[PDB]
Design a protein around this ligand. Structure first.
Ligand SMILES: O=C(Nc1sc2c(c1C(=O)O)CCCC2)c1ccc(Cl)cc1
Ligand SMILES: O=C(Nc1sc2c(c1C(=O)O)CCCC2)c1ccc(Cl)cc1
Lengths: 455, 564
């Protein structure tokens, strides 16, 4: 699988010609050591005083050239290694963002952060070390073998100062050739990790089949929403979900319902392959992933706040449109300004300490404030998992109602009172909808009354 | 770090003496190379003819000794490094459990365990390479320098002048490298946290956001890390050449007056060549000895693993006793209040019978699962005494209390190594492989592991193997069975409702339920039906426990049974 690794280095053939020069000069020095040792024998035998006294300059020059070659070769191998690991890390992160997010369910965050970081370092370290040692090995072996073949010709039968030079140049093969038989160890160690990252380097991908920029419709119509849980069994049976613009409809489901799974289909998450979502001649890929994500803003019950400055969390989805007046209006709309402004100054709160500054209620209020400030054409409200009782429970409920009244919203039945206050209520049990129309008919039938009393 | 690391191979006194001899005899041969070339020069200069017979035998014997010494030394240092790393892994595995409730609860051990294992493996590689290099190169350098002293004692200016400057230069370089490694580690932590909080926050980034902002933030952090690393490796790859040049300059200087005219070393012409050669033999080993500085000091700096266990309090387990199989972990009038939050369980006196199946019925995220998991030091529980088997649980040691209890969690029990190491017990010698395999054969997960690759003949536990949630849950169940703990806690929500091995999983669970007491929280109707006795708790408090017939008779419990 190492073949594709060369493509990531193909940017760097301009600098890869310097490491060859460096290790070539290193090999030249490690061959010329034999030249020097042969030189001294003849100098002593013939008592050639001039070069004999000149010898220390030869030693210093040889070691300096060896050092320069090793320095530049090693540094440029390091540059290749670091730039390669940076490029691989950036590309794998870019792809890992796009993936359809079912990978996130079964694969925990710990495994992903272990992979994307340690695995790539292991791969690049093994590859760089193997390449460095194989280049050094090959070039020194070529130089020394040429030096041997220059004098004593053949050596296959076994397998004055000139004799000394030959035996030295033959002995020098010892450590390089020992590296030769050891490269495969590092290569296989790198192989053990390469498949883990390179397989994820493609690992399928989510795309924008519709490829339509315009998505300011505000109307959603879903027909026969049937999804099979990992192709083993249907999560929810067929149901018709037609939502008119502006109007808000409340959805109530029994135990085992898709709930967040059903809503996520409307947000281009876990797209329903078995479905008939067609509104105003728009297919399942109505506009695009980015367009459908921007036009519809959800309020997740999990409520996750990034460990960054409050400036970053205030305008995550609207970076250019970051306005102080808009942020103030959002803080007024949802009763969260007091919680943010109590501990820090407020303009730049800089949330930190692993979220210890703000409690869970303040975090939920901040999430609701961000959802309100999104002001998307369509919103999905889901707060069932949140605690019913809170210090600012009434304020949070009022903020949620104000956000729902802004545009079209389909509730996830966070509270029984909220569902009752909703004008339109639709109930689907086990994937089958038995309640429809005005809430007066449902109240008269009392079908949802028992569920509300139980919950 | 060195002081504590030394005490980890010190008890292995027997294996220590048998690794040094190989590198010592290697150094002896390497030194004898100079004596050999001294032999050759005077053999060629004079009319000696027996050299034609001496030389091949001497070369063959030297090669044989070098090969034998290197092989023996490498194998023995490999086994020593492996044993040391196994000891580190055993110590961290024992001490991973019971490090405060907040530390385990907040991080959920999903990333902490991975970070710890990564640090341990980095220390593994660094220690192995550094130890091999330091021992071999030190022995060869000391032996060769001893030869230098023996050959010409009066030549001592090489020790003088330059060598202290070389030493202080090396120390300064090491200090500067540590300074750069500090910033490298800082950027490492920053980018790690950015990536982790991006992973946990995919819902927000896809709901109302664009990936480009997060991509730019990650790009900035990664480029800063790149620049710091390039500066660090500038320092690294520049350290060795300059020290090589300065020491070689010192050697040339001492040779110059050692080769001064009208002395010529009394015109020996054989000893001087041997000395020059032996001095040249220093080049590569000393270069390796300088280069190992980076690896060793990077390992030391990354050795925060040796510090994580050094900082841990344990005061509750002051009973100085281990009840082992208590048989009943019960709490009377147990009420625990979270910090800056309402109490999850109030006026709860739940008790666990010996060997009786117990389950918790409640909504997702309710207090039932929290109360069930509260047995293993989930909360301080300062208010409200809890006594198990008519004795407070603080008497038992924290390690003993944790080990005696068993929990089912695929994420927590997931070793990033081969499946054989995945079911590794407390001790290597305590648990025989054959018995563990036979016991785990009841779980019927042996076929699932064997179908993908071969854990016995090849490394297992890859991404594909870990992606199977059912396989991971079955492996954890098998490990718990091999533990033979008195109390077992399991979650049926993680397990797939419908699967090919669902019937086998249900049969294995039914078989295991009779063996030992289970307080497993069951989210599946199959386990509820298999449960003879069920505990129903509302808002963290259980009014009473009734049988299946009693639950069916009561309308409120019948509705819950019909729902799930
Ligand atoms: O003669 C040998 N090796 C030499 S001679 C010399 C040097 C070396 C070396 O170890 O690189 C270093 C530079 C100065 C002169 C040798 C001969 C036979 C074997 Cl079976 C192994 C080694
Ligand atoms: O003595 C050293 N280097 C020499 S002197 C010499 C030679 C070499 C060599 O590079 O092998 C080759 C044969 C002729 C004379 C030396 C000593 C200490 C260090 Cl830290 C590094 C190098």
């Amino acid at each position: 699988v190492y073949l594709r690794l060369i493509s990531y280095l193909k940017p760097y053939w301009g600098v890869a010609l310097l490491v060859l020069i460096g290790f070539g000069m290193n090999s030249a020095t490690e061959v010329s050591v034999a030249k020097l040792i042969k030189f001294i024998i003849d100098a002593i035998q013939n008592a050639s005083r001039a070069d004999l006294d000149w010898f220390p300059l030869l030693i210093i020059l040889l070691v300096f050239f060896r050092g320069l070659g090793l320095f530049m070769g090693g540094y440029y191998t390091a540059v290749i290694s670091r730039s390669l690991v940076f490029s691989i890390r950036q590309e794998v992160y870019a792809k890992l963002l796009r993936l359809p997010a079912q990978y996130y369910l079964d694969n925990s965050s710990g495994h992903i952060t272990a992979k994307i970081m340690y695995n790539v370092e292991q791969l690049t370290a093994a590859s760089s070390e193997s390449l460095k040692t194989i280049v050094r090995d090959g070039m020194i072996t070529l130089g020394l073998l040429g030096y041997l073949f220059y004098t004593n010709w053949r050596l296959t039968i076994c397998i004055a100062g000139e004799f000394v030079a030959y035996i030295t140049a033959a002995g020098l093969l010892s450590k390089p050739v020992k590296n030769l038989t050891d490269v495969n160890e590092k290569l296989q160690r790198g192989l053990a990790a390469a498949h883990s990252v390179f397989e994820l380097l493609d690992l399928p991908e989510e795309q924008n089949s519709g490829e339509l920029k315009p998505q300011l419709q505000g109307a959603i119509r879903f027909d026969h929403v049937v999804l099979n849980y990992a192709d083993g069994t249907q999560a929810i049976k067929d149901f018709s979900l037609d939502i008119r613009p502006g109007e808000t409809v409340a959805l109530v489901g029994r135990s085992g319902a898709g709930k967040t799974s059903l809503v996520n289909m409307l947000v281009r998450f876990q797209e329903v392959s078995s479905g008939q979502i067609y509104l105003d001649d728009l297919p399942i890929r109505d506009i695009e992933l980015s367009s459908l994500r921007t036009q519809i803003a959800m309020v997740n019950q999990q409520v996750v706040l990034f460990n960054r400055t409050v400036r970053e969390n205030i305008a995550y989805g609207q970076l250019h449109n970051a306005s102080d007046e808009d942020v103030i209006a959002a803080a007024k709309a949802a009763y969260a300004h007091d919680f943010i402004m109590n501990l820090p100054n407020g303009y730049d709160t800089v949330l930190g300490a692993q979220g210890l500054n703000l409690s869970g209620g303040q975090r939920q209020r901040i999430a609701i404030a961000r959802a309100i400030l999104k002001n998307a054409p369509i919103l999905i409200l889901d707060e069932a998992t949140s605690a019913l009782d809170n210090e600012s429970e009434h304020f949070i409920q009022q903020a949620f109602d104000e956000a729902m009244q802004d545009r079209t919203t389909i509730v996830i039945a966070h509270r029984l009172s909220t569902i009752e206050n909703a004008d339109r209520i639709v109930v689907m049990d086990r994937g089958q909808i038995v309640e429809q129309g005005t809430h007066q008919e449902l109240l008269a039938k009392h079908g949802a009354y028992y569920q509300l009393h139980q919950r």
